[PDB]
Design a protein around this ligand. Structure first.
Ligand SMILES: Nc1ncnc2c1ncn2[C@@H]1O[C@H](CSCC[C@H](N)C(=O)O)[C@@H](O)[C@H]1O
Ligand SMILES: Nc1ncnc2c1ncn2[C@@H]1O[C@H](CSCC[C@H](N)C(=O)O)[C@@H](O)[C@H]1O
Ligand SMILES: COc1cc(O)cc2c1C(=O)c1c(O)cccc1C2=O
Ligand SMILES: COc1cc(O)cc2c1C(=O)c1c(O)cccc1C2=O
Ligand SMILES: [Cl-]
Ligand SMILES: [Cl-]
Ligand code: NA
Ligand code: NA
Ligand code: NA
Ligand code: NA
Lengths: 319, 319
């Protein structure tokens, strides 16, 4: 029935995980039709049991069935690429750590101790836990790198980065957003601030071990804060933006770049942010309120279209 | 995007689990519109965070919004009743044991040692593992009891049980099917065979600790095997049906009752049976083949429509 299949939504995620995480999906590059008998002989996957998984993947629209063969659907071409953001998303979505966090979600709703479902499961908040877990950290940082790579071309197209001299990407992770910007916009100073036990190394990138809850370093005319605030409470968000306002002079600019809450799109990500961080999706208006409270003003507003989600682009300056 | 929401199908299951497993759904009995402010004050659930969950549950069609209040959709009325099959399905669907089984599914497809994804995760096959896990055993047996209770009315309607005298339900679990048949079909001898560490007690029900892989007790004129064969390989299924043929005389009948593989219905359950048992869903044709190979012939076939799945009713007799 519709309802029992809704209850069993997890089966769709777990099916995709088996198909993509094993690397079986990498045999379906360039929309090629795959004979499962041949794939079974080449890969050593069980023919009868994988054929049954392929029938389910057809039902979900991941595979297209023709002439006793299967191809990826046009939109699922990304599953053939293990470097795609969707491949890294699949690795994490139903990993044990996320699963066990989701199992504490119900209980998390009856607590007001500021402990995420993730912390209730694993004993530390998300990013603190990732310091001790290479699987989660490597794959999460990899995922953030892939979605950074996807938006950078559109970002360069809607904002003049050439006007700026000193650029700091705050919570920039592996720092791939600025590495890509630095390749198109030459002759600037490029710095990336995050939590680093060992500093990353990249050509003409200054990696700074820091904490945006404590302080943001002064002496940059461009600050970038991309996909950070949705990991934080309203109070922690205001604290971060206040730390920016203190670090900024009259001429400096802050680019607040985030996935933005719109009524046309699914709320599933809003619930994941609650489970992992006690974070939330915010509308442009809700972002603007937090900026105002922190003593910042909106100079420019733009919407950037990504395949998976709309993005708010908010240029901020001190009042 | 549709694709990222497909990858994140698990979030739908986890949201329903948080809503139902906490008992919050039990505040929505009799299609009543609930004020979330009042529910938050009464239950101690966080208002803002539960309201966000309610928005996701409306999106999924579990909740219906009117006048800033929420009711269960008509089909989701079952979530208000903690004794419903749908409540027990929710409890098990994303429990840690099922999740960890699903995470071994990919690896299971490359092995041919007869070890299920579940056994690979947990160290024993499903039913053996349940002997040492009260959470899994009690909830699984409860789920089977609820779905037995749902089918009994239509089953009595399509077959004359009054013609029989000695009736054995094989792998009958808690014995709910025969207990319900017994209270509408009086004056018979009722027996239930399963794997019991302690024999259940029920009025005029003979509970038998047995093993249908080894032997079925003879002398019954009606045998019932409901929702067993989908837990077993084709070879183990033939063995079970062979043990019936040995136990049966000319006059005895075997009612093979099972969820049946139809093209119109989802293959998700077929994949779950692979993960948990190296089992599978079968068409009437495939069931008839197994029966024939065991030396049983089809006397009559009927289709029983249940809300969640179509059922095959197959009356079998010795050659
Ligand atoms: N207290 C803190 N100080 C600095 N960085 C922090 C932090 N807590 C979390 N972070 C970092 O914040 C980042 C959030 S994920 C976003 C990464 C990057 N801006 C992008 O959009 O692709 C992570 O890299 C995490 O390590
Ligand atoms: N070797 C074995 N011998 C007997 N019963 C077995 C068995 N292995 C598993 N079972 C039982 O088979 C049942 C499968 S679930 C089906 C239960 C019931 N017939 C119903 O339709 O609701 C479980 O109760 C399980 O304990
Ligand atoms: C916990 O996951 C995230 C944390 C972030 O700070 C930002 C993103 C994510 C995501 O999981 C994510 C995703 O799964 C798909 C597309 C984008 C993102 C994030 O930007
Ligand atoms: C392990 O799960 C099952 C094993 C069975 O032998 C029969 C059923 C199930 C189910 O999980 C199940 C379900 O989740 C929802 C409706 C029916 C069933 C079974 O009949
Ligand atoms: Cl997402
Ligand atoms: Cl089901
Ligand atoms: Na719970
Ligand atoms: Na189940
Ligand atoms: Na889970
Ligand atoms: Na889990």
């Amino acid at each position: 029935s519709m309802l029992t299949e809704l209850i069993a939504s997890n089966r769709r995620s777990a099916a995709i995980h088996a198909f993509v995480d094993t690397g079986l999906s990498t045999h379906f590059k360039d929309g090629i039709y795959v004979d499962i008998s041949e794939l079974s002989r080449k890969s050593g996957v069980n023919y009868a049991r994988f054929s049954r998984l392929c029938d389910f993947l057809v039902e979900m629209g991941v595979l297209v069935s023709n002439d006793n063969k299967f191809r990826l659907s046009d939109e699922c071409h990304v599953f053939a690429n293990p470097e795609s953001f969707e491949s890294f998303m699949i690795k994490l979505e139903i990993c044990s750590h996320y699963s066990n966090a989701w199992l504490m979600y119900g209980k998390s709703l009856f607590e007001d101790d500021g402990k995420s479902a993730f912390e209730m499961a694993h004993g530390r908040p998300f990013f603190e836990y990732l310091d001790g877990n290479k699987f989660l950290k490597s794959n999460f940082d990899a995922l953030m790198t892939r979605v950074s790579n996807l938006i950078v071309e559109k970002l360069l197209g809607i904002y003049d980065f050439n006007q700026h001299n000193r650029i700091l990407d705050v919570g920039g992770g592996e720092g791939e957003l600025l590495v890509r910007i630095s390749e198109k916009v030459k002759g600037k100073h490029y710095a990336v601030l995050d939590r680093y036990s060992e500093l990353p190394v990249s050509d003409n990138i200054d990696f700074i071990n820091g904490n945006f809850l404590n302080s943001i370093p002064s002496g940059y005319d461009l600050y970038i804060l991309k996909n950070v605030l949705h990991n934080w409470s309203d109070s922690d968000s205001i604290l971060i933006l206040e730390n920016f306002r203190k670090a900024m002079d009259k001429n400096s600019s802050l680019l607040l770049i985030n996935m933005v809450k719109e009524p046309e799109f699914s709320r599933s990500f809003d619930i994941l942010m609650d489970v992992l961080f006690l974070g939330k999706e915010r509308s442009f208006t809700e972002f603007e309120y937090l900026a105002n409270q922190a003593g910042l003003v909106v100079q420019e507003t733009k919407v950037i279209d990504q395949s998976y989600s709309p993005y708010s682009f908010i240029k901020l300056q001190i009042k």
